């Protein structure tokens, strides 16, 4: 089995930087030029002295109808999904589409290790970072509760694709979905 990972997250959060970062290896300043995604990007991690992955790199989300991605299909085959978050931005259509998306897809797959990216935080204050991932952590989980769905796990991480933080949370989603 091939593990899968997906990078979904409203649009402009930074889901493709941190793909061509983590695993490109691009510079976080090269991301600059990257345009905005039209469709599912899949890149496979293979041959891993650590373990295999498929990487889905999702275009933001957005209230167009299309019930053409079969996301039973894609949910039924994922092993973690990573709903990406920009700090620096209001984040409460964020919090709304992280709770339908984690919802939607623990309906499927219960076994889906939940990760939320509370990104670029490096344009935050060594506080102003405690109290976003407050908030976030608080709201998530009581969005859960309100559903009766409080058992569904959500990890949060501070990330940046600016320094080590973004590796460090990739490499602790990664290491959860080796046996
Ligand atoms: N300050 C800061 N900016 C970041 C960070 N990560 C990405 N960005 C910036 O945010 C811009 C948008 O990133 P992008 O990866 O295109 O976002 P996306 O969610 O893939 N957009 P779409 O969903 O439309 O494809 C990037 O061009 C980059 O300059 C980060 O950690 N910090
Ligand atoms: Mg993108």
Redesign the pocket.
Known sequence: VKPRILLM??????????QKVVFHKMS?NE??F?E??NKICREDVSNSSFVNFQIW????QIDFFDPTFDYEMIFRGTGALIF?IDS?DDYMEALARLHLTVTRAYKVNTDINFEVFI??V??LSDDHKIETQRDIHQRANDDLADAGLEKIHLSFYL????DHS?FEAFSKVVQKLIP
Do not use: M
Not at 57 to 60: A, N, T, W
Not at 159 to 162: F, L
């Open positions: 997250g409203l649009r402009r959060s930074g889901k493709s930087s941190i976080p991301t600059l990257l905005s995604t790199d999702f275009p933001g990406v620096q990104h670029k490096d344009g990330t940046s694709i600016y973004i």
